[PDB]
């Protein structure tokens, strides 16, 4: 039920402006399906990656809160994405967190109530610090945030768009490797995460904050 | 090799501005994988839908050329998307066709050279009028166009964003039902189709044409 | 819509007395499911059996009309099940054909409208003489008849109950081997085929005809 | 080795009168088969249902002993099935418990010695009060009892036949959801459970007890 | 039934000296198994390779008769394996053809009578010049020959053992790619093909012919 | 890095003489593949065999060190294969242990670093006395030893070649049943285990030791 009217620091949009995820998305793969067989195999594979350097990154990524995703792009972006160094940018990206994380995922989350892999398996994640929810797996709100942030970051810095998009992609993949999400939750999440950035471009406040981040970035360039 | 410098009526962007699809996307499911088993089952299911009213629409959609996608949104959009009735809009959407269809899909297309389902199966499509290519299935350039158009349309008309996005989604699904594309080609295509609309928002000409389509739409509203 | 009131030679029961197959049965396996993967493998296996002596029997069985099932038990039963030799018996078994074949399968048939294997595969059966329906596969009305007949036959001749039940079982298996039905259609059919024989035992006319078949069988025994 | 001659309170039939389950039934799905893959997925799905209201019922059903199945139909039947209220009926249903549970399942049970799901998985059931056997899974004697009871109940009260059959069906499904049995054990069990009610109708004592239950039910009706 | 006593030009060994393939080998994957699912996917994959340069080689290899395998190693071996150039060698390798092709595969061939992929699929091979047998697929006699020849060639020229073994391996893989054999037939064939070279080393005539091929090769080396 | 020059008691061959396993072998089945699905099912099946008499043997076999494989053939061979009773033979077989176990498996082992089943599953083996490695599963060095020993044993005693080869086969199968190895590791291992016996026949010391074992066996025969 929250939105910009209750939490204007974390949403630009209203409840009425949300992507209807329940309407747009396909249902998650069901148990008994081949597509779920594949979700399982992707789980086991990520599981085997846990011991690697990519595994290490995934555990780190899995430690990210919604709030740390913005700064999680710094390396892809080419420069620190921080309150200190890029305040107009940090503010932009923070203020859209729950537009992407909540508004864009909610109706499908709440309807399907899907069990996460670690919970399905009665194990823990690769990670494993908050009191982990077992549920509302589909789609991934974290992946929706990471994808939506990559799309707006790619627009601010098209010179590094590919690195940015790949980071965005990988944030979601980290959740699959660490056992937080099925591959399909993360895939579904990139669809709604894209849709919400269309809506954000209709929003005056977003528009203005984006201009500011662009201007900031520009001066940044010398 | 084409781009805006060779075909400025069908691209806003340059070769250098393209999404590196080969870099961003996962490889397509391989034969021997469970994920390919699923692509197959999705093929057979779409195949069984061919006889239905959804099957009818998919055959119609499958008749669309890149150029007919814009107008294919008219019902979702709420009003005719035509040269006659919405010229600023039609122009916008046409001019980005190959940004989405080509630039955003090319490196992965050309690298993987994937076989389409009808060709894999040695059958025809649900459709079946051009001399069908057997290949460069992954990702789908048609689905990339349809998704990217839905994202920019959703921005022009957020009141109908959900209907618009669902139409966009379904254009790609039509290609799976009709046998033109594997489900994974269409899924991959929505990722690059989103990425290219980020890039388009960095482009002055696009920006200006989008303002015009917005203004046109506005007067349209009475 | 037919029943005993329209076709009293082929039903004992009324429409109101039918097994609600749509209510009782699980849905058929869907395309995309592992259970459908198994239906497919059972298809291919039966297909390979077509060349054998069991294949020969299945083609013969597949030539049976509903009316020929009764006599199709003669060998299992131990003696000819014919108008000539066992008229009280033949009459009993004929008069319940559509109770089992129709009434007991109808609501699920008509609701699911499932595609038969030969039609799914765009091939023919092992058989292949009537104008084959592509559809209403689930459940199998022929298997429902064969199972229900085996149950009532087993009651008349418990000395040969095992041979009788195995024949009953195999009639349905013949339809899987020949490509007429998915294994799941035949399995579903044995459930409703059993349910309808419970109902038949509540029916005065059935009861009386069954007494006659028992008496006939008795004199048959010397 | 028991039968009516050793335990005439729990069998109507003799050893010689049993359904030869080993002869009639297909072998259970083997490990390495797709049909076993499906048994597994049905296990995991039931497992996810454990938390629901259907899960609650399944745990309750899983607490049933053979003796409590009769009364487990009371709601489907429309009235209490109890020694107190429906003694002729309760007696009928009790006296056939092991005809269905044992005689009808024995040869296949003992031959295949199949491992139950909880034991396969080295876990417990949804339930989990007796010292659980790991083995003789195929077919399910509990499901055979529940199905056979539904068939004879459906005959006593055809007005509620559909509710009765659905309850019967669900008793077996409870065992799949709770982890006691593979879906295939329960499916196999409905086949032999039907066969044994054919045999029961040949048995004088059963016939007479069934008449009594019918008469009792009749007076019950006012 | 043939052997060295009937065809001493094509066998060194007798019937009594054969590898009992039926005894040693596992059964082939059955339809309904996951291992057969994999045989199928390996079929489809080879099928897609048919258009490539590896596809070209496989079609060529598929044109080989048993008699042409020896010379088919010339490139791996480093020098022509021909009657003209390496007669002692050519003779050795020819004289063991049916030891490997027949004796080592026969009992399993004849027992299982397995259907080849092209026949299973009702299609042709990649090849497709003799009147193709549909059957005795398991194991592959051609692959048994190619593997057994690679093992004896590797012994004559250990400097090129790796190239030789890889050629040997690939001869069998060519049969999978071209649709002549399931992957499992070819795998099974390498087991019996190895076993028969153990037996060949017990055979005086083989021993002597092998000494001659070694001596010939030696002079070949300058 | 060891070989005959460092450990001449356990290798006949040098590093340069090794089978290039990385070059020859296919990659192991990947997670996400159907072939891995099959490796899993073979794991679960062996797992269910653990309780049987074959299970008992597999646990015993799993207790074998490389050094105990030679004597593990005594029953197949027909007579004790021991330092006491068959010293020339025991010496032969010992001296080739690491040719088969190490040299023939190394490059593929070290490259793929595959996880063993018990480790994949986070369980123990059927066995479970050394500090079990989790890794270098593909191919199995133990199976390579057992197969290579069966091939050289079959040559010494062709009268018992079939029993010998079947024992050889089963040694590897024991590792699958006990959870030490995937079926594919064991299959891959029989390929390289055959290749190394070709190389061994090029080695003077091996040749001479083999003559001695043959002579010993001969006198053994009376």
Provide the token pair at A153.
Answer: 């970051």
Provide the token pair at C13.
Answer: 């029961």
Provide the token pair at F208.
Answer: 């001479």
The DSSP bridge partners found for residue A33 are C33
Touching pair E, D by Cβ (3+ pairs < 8 Å): yes
Provide the token pair at D46.
Answer: 């039931």
A110 C-beta neighbours (distance < 10 Å), count: 12
Catalytic residue status for D111: no
* Distances in whole angstroms, Cα of residue B76 to Cα of each of B166, B170, B207, C183: 8, 11, 23, 43
Q: Phi and psi at residue E13, in whole multiples of 5°? A: -105, 165
Which site among E185, E191, E192, E207 would you substitute to test the F interface, given the most F Cβ atoms closer than 10 Å to its Cβ?
E191
**Burial call F192-216: b when 16+ CB within 10 Å, e when fewer:** bbbbbbbbbbbbeebeebbeebbeb
| Separation in Å, CA of F14 to nearest CA in chain D | 41
User: For residues E152 and E198, what is the distance between their CA atoms, to the nearest angstrom?
Assistant: 10
Does the beta carbon of A23 lie under 8 angstroms from any beta carbon of chain B? yes
Which site among B165, B187, B217 would you substitute to test the A interface, given the most A Cβ atoms closer than 10 Å to its Cβ?
B165
The DSSP bridge partners found for residue D33 are E33
CB F2 within 8 A of CB F12: no
Give F46-54 contacts, CB < 8 A, sequence gap 24+.
F46/F176, F46/F177, F46/F178, F46/F179, F47/F126, F47/F177, F47/F179, F48/D31, F48/D115, F48/D120, F49/F177, F50/F126, F50/F177, F50/F178, F54/F177
User: For residues C137 and C35, what is the distance between their CA atoms, to the nearest angstrom?
Assistant: 16
D219 C-beta neighbours (distance < 10 Å), count: 7
Q: Closest by alpha carbon to B157, among B68, B61, B67, B74? A: B74
Does the beta carbon of F44 lie under 8 angstroms from any beta carbon of chain D? yes
Q: Closest by alpha carbon to B4, among B143, B199, B155, B141? A: B199
CB D6 within 8 A of CB E9: no
Query: Locate tokens 């024991």: which residue?
Result: F174
What kind and span of H or E run contains B46?
helix B34-49
- DSSP percent split of chain C into helix, strand, coil, nearest 5: 65, 0, 35
User: For residues B120 and E44, what is the distance between their CA atoms, to the nearest angstrom?
Assistant: 9
- How many CA atoms, within 13 angstroms, populate the side-chain half-sphere of residue A55? 13
User: For residues C123 and D29, what is the distance between their CA atoms, to the nearest angstrom?
Assistant: 28
B26 C-beta neighbours (distance < 10 Å), count: 15
C-alpha angle with apex C193: C192 to C195, nearest 5 degrees? Answer: 60
Residue of A nearest to F33 (CA): A41
CB B187 within 8 A of CB B135: no
> Which experimental approach was used here?
X-ray
Q: Is E84 exposed, middle or buried (0-12, 13-18, 19+ CB in 10 A)?
A: exposed
Catalytic residue status for C185: yes
CB E179 within 8 A of CB E48: no
User: For residues E211 and F206, what is the distance between their CA atoms, to the nearest angstrom?
Assistant: 17
Omega before C214 within 30 of 0, i.e. cis: no
Provide the token pair at F156.
Answer: 């010494």
User: For residues B104 and B6, what is the distance between their CA atoms, to the nearest angstrom?
Assistant: 16
The answer for residues whose C-beta is within 8 angstroms of residue C189's C-beta and 6 or more apart is C105, C139, C140, C141, C142, C143, C144, C147, C172
The answer for residues whose C-beta is within 8 angstroms of residue D92's C-beta and 6 or more apart is D152, D206, D209, D210, D212, D213
D48 C-beta neighbours (distance < 10 Å), count: 16
| Helices and strands (H, E) in chain C, number of each type | 13, 0
Provide the token pair at A188.
Answer: 């579904």
User: For residues C157 and C142, what is the distance between their CA atoms, to the nearest angstrom?
Assistant: 22
Query: Locate tokens 């999680």: which residue?
Result: A72
User: For residues C212 and C222, what is the distance between their CA atoms, to the nearest angstrom?
Assistant: 16
Query: Crossing angle, helix F141-156 and helix F204-220, to 10 degrees?
Result: 60
A1 C-beta neighbours (distance < 10 Å), count: 6
Does the beta carbon of F201 lie under 8 angstroms from any beta carbon of chain E? yes
Q: How many residues does chain A have?
A: 222
D43 alpha-carbon distance from chain centroid: 19
Contacts of B48 in chain C (CB under 8 A): 31, 115, 120
Q: Which residues of F are catalytic?
A: 142, 175, 181, 185
**Burial call E146-173: b when 16+ CB within 10 Å, e when fewer:** bbbbbbbbbbbbbebbbbbbbbbbbbbb
Chain-chain contact of E202 with F155 (C-beta, under 8 angstroms): yes
Does the beta carbon of D32 lie under 8 angstroms from any beta carbon of chain E? yes
3-state DSSP of D130-163:
CCCCCCCCCCCHHHHHHHHHHHHHHHHCHHHHHH
Provide the token pair at F68.
Answer: 């105990």
CB C30 within 8 A of CB C175: no
Q: Is E45 exposed, middle or buried (0-12, 13-18, 19+ CB in 10 A)?
A: middle
Chain-chain contact of C165 with D201 (C-beta, under 8 angstroms): no
**Burial call B93-115: b when 16+ CB within 10 Å, e when fewer:** bbbbbbbbbbbbbbbbbeebebb
Q: Closest by alpha carbon to D120, among A118, A123, F45? A: F45
Provide the token pair at D69.
Answer: 């199945």
Q: Is C164 exposed, middle or buried (0-12, 13-18, 19+ CB in 10 A)?
A: buried
User: For residues E209 and E213, what is the distance between their CA atoms, to the nearest angstrom?
Assistant: 6
User: For residues D47 and D181, what is the distance between their CA atoms, to the nearest angstrom?
Assistant: 12
CB F194 within 8 A of CB F155: no
CB D117 within 8 A of CB D182: yes
User: For residues C117 and C135, what is the distance between their CA atoms, to the nearest angstrom?
Assistant: 9
SS3 D221: coil
User: For residues A195 and A197, what is the distance between their CA atoms, to the nearest angstrom?
Assistant: 5
User: For residues B77 and B93, what is the distance between their CA atoms, to the nearest angstrom?
Assistant: 13
C-alpha angle with apex F154: F149 to F156, nearest 5 degrees? Answer: 100
CB D56 within 8 A of CB D168: no
| Residue among B24, B35, B162 minimizing CB distance to A165 | B24
User: For residues B99 and B105, what is the distance between their CA atoms, to the nearest angstrom?
Assistant: 9
User: For residues B207 and F23, what is the distance between their CA atoms, to the nearest angstrom?
Assistant: 55
| Separation in Å, CA of B36 to nearest CA in chain A | 9
Touching pair F, C by Cβ (3+ pairs < 8 Å): no
Does the beta carbon of E115 lie under 8 angstroms from any beta carbon of chain C? yes
User: For residues F138 and F191, what is the distance between their CA atoms, to the nearest angstrom?
Assistant: 12
Chain-chain contact of E31 with C48 (C-beta, under 8 angstroms): yes
User: For residues D39 and D31, what is the distance between their CA atoms, to the nearest angstrom?
Assistant: 10
- Resolution (angstroms) stands at 1.9
Chain-chain contact of A32 with D41 (C-beta, under 8 angstroms): yes
Contacts of E31 in chain C (CB under 8 A): 41, 44-45, 48
Rounded to a whole number of angstroms, the CA Rg of chain D reads 17
Q: Sign of the C-alpha dihedral, residues A177, A180, A181, A186?
A: negative
The active-site residue out of B142, B160, B167, B190 is: B142
SS3 E99: helix
User: Gaps (C–N > 2.5 Å) in chain B: which residues precede them?
Assistant: 128
Provide the token pair at F60.
Answer: 């015993």
CB F24 within 8 A of CB F204: no
- How many CA atoms, within 13 angstroms, populate the side-chain half-sphere of residue A60? 11
The DSSP bridge partners found for residue C206 are none
User: For residues E184 and F113, what is the distance between their CA atoms, to the nearest angstrom?
Assistant: 25
The active-site residue out of D106, D116, D167, D175 is: D175
What kind and span of H or E run contains A211?
helix A204-220
Give the domain ranges of chain A. Answer: 1-222
Chains that touch E (3 or more CB pairs under 8 A): B, C, D, F
What kind and span of H or E run contains B165?
helix B161-178
**Burial call C1-31: b when 16+ CB within 10 Å, e when fewer:** eebbeeeeebbbbeeebbbbbeebbeebbeb
Provide the token pair at F64.
Answer: 């074998």
User: For residues A167 and A152, what is the distance between their CA atoms, to the nearest angstrom?
Assistant: 13
Query: Locate tokens 């299911």: which residue?
Result: B45
| Residue among D41, D42, D48 minimizing CB distance to A115 | D48
SS3 D33: strand
Provide the token pair at D120.
Answer: 């396969």
Query: Crossing angle, helix C141-156 and helix C87-95, to 10 degrees?
Result: 140
User: For residues F144 and F141, what is the distance between their CA atoms, to the nearest angstrom?
Assistant: 5
Q: Is A75 exposed, middle or buried (0-12, 13-18, 19+ CB in 10 A)?
A: middle
In the 8-state DSSP scheme, what is residue A3? -
* Distances in whole angstroms, Cα of residue D103 to Cα of each of D108, D148, D202, D209, E4: 10, 13, 15, 20, 58
User: For residues D147 and D141, what is the distance between their CA atoms, to the nearest angstrom?
Assistant: 10
C-alpha angle with apex A115: B31 to B46, nearest 5 degrees? Answer: 40
F95 alpha-carbon distance from chain centroid: 14
User: For residues B142 and B101, what is the distance between their CA atoms, to the nearest angstrom?
Assistant: 6
Does the beta carbon of B202 lie under 8 angstroms from any beta carbon of chain A? yes
The active-site residue out of A114, A181, A187, A190 is: A181
Q: Is D111 exposed, middle or buried (0-12, 13-18, 19+ CB in 10 A)?
A: middle
Q: Closest by alpha carbon to D110, among D129, D133, D127, D131? A: D133
User: For residues A163 and A169, what is the distance between their CA atoms, to the nearest angstrom?
Assistant: 10
Q: Phi and psi at residue B33, in whole multiples of 5°? A: -90, 155
Contacts of A28 in chain C (CB under 8 A): none
Query: Crossing angle, helix A141-156 and helix A87-95, to 10 degrees?
Result: 140
The answer for residues whose C-beta is within 8 angstroms of residue A120's C-beta and 6 or more apart is D44, D48
Topology of domain A1-222, CATH = Vanadium-containing Chloroperoxidase; domain 1 (1.20.144)
In the 8-state DSSP scheme, what is residue F66? G
3-state DSSP of D166-186:
HHHHHHHHHHHHHCCCCHHHH
Chains that touch B (3 or more CB pairs under 8 A): A, C, E, F
SS3 F114: coil
| Helices and strands (H, E) in chain A, number of each type | 13, 0
SS3 A95: helix
The active-site residue out of C47, C90, C116, C142 is: C142
User: For residues D66 and B150, what is the distance between their CA atoms, to the nearest angstrom?
Assistant: 60
Q: Is A80 exposed, middle or buried (0-12, 13-18, 19+ CB in 10 A)?
A: middle
Touching pair D, B by Cβ (3+ pairs < 8 Å): no
Contacts of C115 in chain B (CB under 8 A): 48
Chain-chain contact of B48 with C31 (C-beta, under 8 angstroms): yes
In the 8-state DSSP scheme, what is residue A157? -
Residue of C nearest to A37 (CA): C34
C-alpha angle with apex A102: A101 to A106, nearest 5 degrees? Answer: 125
Q: Phi and psi at residue E157, in whole multiples of 5°? A: -130, 70
The answer for residues whose C-beta is within 8 angstroms of residue F120's C-beta and 6 or more apart is A44, A48
Torsion of CA C21, C24, C28, C34, to 10 degrees: -160
DSSP E112-152: H-PPPHHHHHT---S-------SS--SS-HHHHHHHHHHHH
F72 alpha-carbon distance from chain centroid: 11
Q: Closest by alpha carbon to F104, among F17, F166, F30? A: F17
Provide the token pair at B168.
Answer: 């966009």
User: For residues A34 and C29, what is the distance between their CA atoms, to the nearest angstrom?
Assistant: 12
Q: Closest by alpha carbon to D156, among D104, D64, D79? A: D79
B44 alpha-carbon distance from chain centroid: 22
Chain-chain contact of A32 with C35 (C-beta, under 8 angstroms): yes
Q: Sign of the C-alpha dihedral, residues D142, D145, D147, D150?
A: negative
Does the beta carbon of F45 lie under 8 angstroms from any beta carbon of chain D? yes
Q: Closest by alpha carbon to E96, among E138, E67, E63? A: E67
Does the beta carbon of E41 lie under 8 angstroms from any beta carbon of chain D? no
Q: Closest by alpha carbon to A137, among A170, A163, A172? A: A172
The answer for residues whose C-beta is within 8 angstroms of residue F25's C-beta and 6 or more apart is F108, F138, F139, F188, F191, F192
User: For residues A6 and F161, what is the distance between their CA atoms, to the nearest angstrom?
Assistant: 82
CB E121 within 8 A of CB E56: no
The answer for residues whose C-beta is within 8 angstroms of residue F185's C-beta and 6 or more apart is F28, F114, F137, F138, F139, F140, F143, F175
* Distances in whole angstroms, Cα of residue A96 to Cα of each of A110, A204, B160, F113: 21, 13, 21, 44
User: For residues F217 and F222, what is the distance between their CA atoms, to the nearest angstrom?
Assistant: 9
Chain-chain contact of E34 with D37 (C-beta, under 8 angstroms): yes
User: For residues C96 and F31, what is the distance between their CA atoms, to the nearest angstrom?
Assistant: 54
User: For residues B132 and B118, what is the distance between their CA atoms, to the nearest angstrom?
Assistant: 10
CB F14 within 8 A of CB F22: no
User: For residues C12 and C98, what is the distance between their CA atoms, to the nearest angstrom?
Assistant: 8
Q: Is F5 exposed, middle or buried (0-12, 13-18, 19+ CB in 10 A)?
A: exposed
């Amino acid at each position: 039920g929250n939105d910009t009217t209750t939490k204007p620091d974390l949403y630009y949009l209203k409840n009425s402006e949300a992507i209807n995820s329940l309407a747009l998305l396909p249902p998650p793969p069901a148990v008994g399906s081949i597509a779920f067989l594949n979700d399982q195999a992707m789980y086991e594979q990520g599981r085997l990656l846990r011991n690697t350097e990519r595994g290490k990154l995934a555990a780190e990524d899995a430690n990210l809160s919604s709030g740390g995703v913005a700064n999680a792009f710094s390396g892809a972006f080419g420069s620190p994405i921080t309150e200190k160094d890029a305040p107009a940018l940090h503010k932009l990206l923070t203020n859209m967190i729950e537009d992407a994380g909540d508004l864009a995922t909610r109706s499908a989350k709440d309807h399907y109530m899907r069990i996460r892999p670690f919970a399905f398996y009665g194990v823990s994640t690769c990670n494993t610090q908050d009191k982990l929810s077992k549920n509302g797996s589909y789609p991934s709100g974290h992946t929706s945030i990471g994808w939506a942030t990559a799309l707006v970051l790619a627009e601010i810095n098209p010179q590094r768009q590919n690195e940015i998009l790949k980071r965005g992609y990988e944030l979601g993949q980290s959740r699959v490797i660490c056992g937080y999400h099925w591959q399909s939750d993360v895939d579904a999440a990139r669809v709604v995460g894209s849709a919400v950035v269309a809506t954000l471009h209709t929003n005056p406040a977003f528009q203005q904050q984006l201009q500011k981040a662009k201007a900031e970035f520009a001066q940044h360039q010398k």
